[PDB]
Amino acid sequence: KQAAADRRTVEKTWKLMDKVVRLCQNPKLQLKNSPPYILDILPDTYQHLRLILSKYDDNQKLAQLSENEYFKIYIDSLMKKSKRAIRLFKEGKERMYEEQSQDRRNLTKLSLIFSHMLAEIKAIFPNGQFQGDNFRITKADAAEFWRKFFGDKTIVPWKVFRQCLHEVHQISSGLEAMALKSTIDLTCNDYISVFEFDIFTRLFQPWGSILRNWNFLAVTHPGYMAFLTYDEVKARLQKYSTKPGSYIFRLSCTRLGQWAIGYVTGDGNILQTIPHNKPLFQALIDGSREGFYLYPDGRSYNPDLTGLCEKVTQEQYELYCEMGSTFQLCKICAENDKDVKIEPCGHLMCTSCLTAWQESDGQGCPFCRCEIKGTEPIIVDPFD
C-alpha cells in the first residue's frame, strides 16, 4: 500500500531526481553523451509531471489524481529508483568513474528503467491527462485477455498477472517465470501496466503462441541482442562486415514495442529494417528466403523458425536473467521477494516457500540439501 500521490509526494521525487542529475553531471562519468541519456530523461520526466499537475489544476482535480492507482505506483517507483541511483554513487565511489564496473552497469540498468518509465507515463497520461482506462492494446486477442482478467485496470501486481497468464499460456518453472517477469516488467516495479503488456504482446505476437515466440526469439536465439543503440549494432556487426547476410535483432528504448533488424548488405554496409505490425519470426523467415538474413550474430547456423508458424533449460533462463533486476525475487515461486536466509548455507527464498518446504520435504535446504540449523529474516536489493 503506497502513499497517496499528493503534490508534496510528487515534489519529493523532483528533489531526489535533481540529486541524480547533479551526481550524473560529473565530467569523469562522461554521461552527457551516454545513451539512453539520463541527463535528458530526468528533466523530461520532471516536465511531464509538471504537465500532469497543470491538467489537474484544482483541489478536486488533485484529489482524483492522488487517488489514481497507476499514478500512486508511478510516484512510489520513481522515488525508489531515484534513491537507488543516489545509493549507487554513495557506495560505488571511484568505481562510478570506471565505465566497465558493475556499479556503472547498474547505473545503465536504472537509466533504462527511467527511459521506460518516461515512455509509460507519456502513454498513460498523454498531454498530462489520464487515459489509462481508455488505453488501446494493439493486439485484439491480447486486449481480450486483459479485459477478461483485469477489467478496466491500468496496472496489476506481477503476482496476479502471472497467475492469470498461466491460466491461458502455461509457465513451466520458477526460472521461466523470473525470466518472463524481467521481460514484461520493464519498469522493474513488481507491477504490469497495460502499456508494458501492450509492448510485450506486440514484440512476441501472435498471442496464441506468445510464450513459444518469446522462448524461441528472446531466450534462445543467437541473433537476439536486447536493447542496443545503432552504434552498438554497428560495432557488433563490424567484425562480420566481411560476411553478407550476417544479422542481429534488437530492441530500441526510443521505439518500444518494435524490433530493429540490423544486417550486412551484399556490398558490406550495415543497414537496419523495422518490421511491420507482424511477427518477428515471419520477417526472419522472409528475409532468410530472400538471402538478406542468413547468419545470426555472424554464425553459420540459422535456427529453423517455421515451427512457430504451425525445450529451454534452467541454465538458459538463468543466463537470460543476468541483465534484469530479479535477484531480489524468490527463485522457487517467482512471485514474492526473498525475505529469509537459510543458515548455515545462506540460500535465500520467500517465507511462504520455506514454510511450504518445511511442511513438505524439509530434509535440508531446497537448493543445497544442507541441514537447516536456522533461518534469518533479510532484505534483498536487486543489485546484490
Ligand X SMILES: C[C@H]1CCCN(Cc2cc(C(F)(F)F)c3nn(-c4cccc([C@]5(c6nncn6C)C[C@@H](C)C5)c4)c(=O)n3c2)C1
Asked if 258 touches ligand X (CB under 6 A), the answer is no
Asked if 320 touches Na ion (CB under 5 A), the answer is no
Question: What residues pair up with 156 in beta bridges, in sequence order?
Answer: 192
250-272: buried (b, 16+ CB within 10 Å) or exposed (e) per residue? bbbbeebbbbbbbbbeeeeebeb
Asked if 230 touches ligand X (CB under 6 A), the answer is no
> Of these, 185, 198, 337, 339, which contacts Na ion (CB under 5 A)?
185
Tell the smallest beta-carbon distance from residue 384 to Na ion (Å).
20
106-122: buried (b, 16+ CB within 10 Å) or exposed (e) per residue? bbbbbbbbbbbbbbbbb
Asked if 112 touches ligand X (CB under 6 A), the answer is yes
Q: Which is nearer to Zn ion, 119 or 165 (CB)?
A: 165
Determine contact, residues 120/187, Cβ cutoff 8 Å: yes
Determine contact, residues 315/322, Cβ cutoff 8 Å: no
Closest to 61 (Cα-Cα) out of 5, 122, 126? 5
C-alpha cell at 193: 501496466
282 binds, among ligand X, Na ion, Zn ion, none (CB under 5 to 8 A by kind): none
Q: Which is nearer to Na ion, 157 or 303 (CB)?
A: 157
- Whole-number Å distance between alpha carbons of 271 and 293: 12
The answer to the question of whether 191 is labelled as a binding residue is: yes
Residue with cell 536456522: 374
Question: What residues pair up with 251 in beta bridges, in sequence order?
Answer: 227, 259
The answer to the question of whether 189 is labelled as a binding residue is: yes
Determine contact, residues 107/325, Cβ cutoff 8 Å: no
The residue ranges that bind Zn ion (CB under 5 A) are 330, 332-333, 336, 345, 347, 350, 353, 365, 367-368
Query: Which listed range, 121-129, 162-170, 181-189, 308-316, lies at the site for Na ion (CB under 5 A)?
Result: 181-189
294 contacts: CB under 8 Å, gap ≥ 6: 244, 245, 246, 247, 288, 302
The answer to the question of whether 105 is labelled as a binding residue is: no
Determine contact, residues 253/108, Cβ cutoff 8 Å: no
Tell the smallest beta-carbon distance from residue 184 to ligand X (Å).
8
Asked if 262 touches ligand X (CB under 6 A), the answer is no
Closest to 85 (Cα-Cα) out of 112, 55, 125? 112
Question: What residues pair up with 287 in beta bridges, in sequence order?
Answer: none
> Of these, 46, 97, 207, 227, which contacts ligand X (CB under 6 A)?
227
228 binds, among Zn ion, Na ion, ligand X, none (CB under 5 to 8 A by kind): ligand X
> Of these, 182, 205, 215, 288, which contacts ligand X (CB under 6 A)?
182
> Of these, 29, 156, 165, 253, which contacts ligand X (CB under 6 A)?
253
Q: What is the largest CA-CA distance in the chain?
A: 66
37: left (phi over 0), alpha (psi -120 to 50) or beta: left
Count other C-beta atoms under 10 Å from residue 222's C-beta. 14
| Contact code string over 28-67 relative to ligand X, x by CB under 6 A | -------xx-------------------------------
| Contact code string over 311-350 relative to ligand X, x by CB under 6 A | ---------x--xx--------------------------
108 binds, among Na ion, Zn ion, ligand X, none (CB under 5 to 8 A by kind): ligand X
283 binds, among Na ion, Zn ion, ligand X, none (CB under 5 to 8 A by kind): none
The answer to the question of whether 185 is labelled as a binding residue is: yes
CA atoms lying within 13 Å on the CB side of residue 103:
16
The answer to the question of whether 196 is labelled as a binding residue is: yes
Q: Which is nearer to ligand X, 105 or 278 (CB)?
A: 105
286 contacts: CB under 8 Å, gap ≥ 6: none
The answer to the question of whether 22 is labelled as a binding residue is: no
Asked if 187 touches Na ion (CB under 5 A), the answer is yes
Residue with cell 482535480: 61
323 binds, among Zn ion, Na ion, ligand X, none (CB under 5 to 8 A by kind): ligand X
Q: Which spans of this chain sit near Na ion (rule: CB under 5 A)?
A: 185, 187, 189, 191
Query: Contact residues for ligand X (CB under 6 A)?
Result: 35-36, 105, 108-109, 112, 182-183, 226-229, 232, 251, 253, 320, 323-324
Annotated binding site for Ca(2+): 185, 187, 189, 191, 196
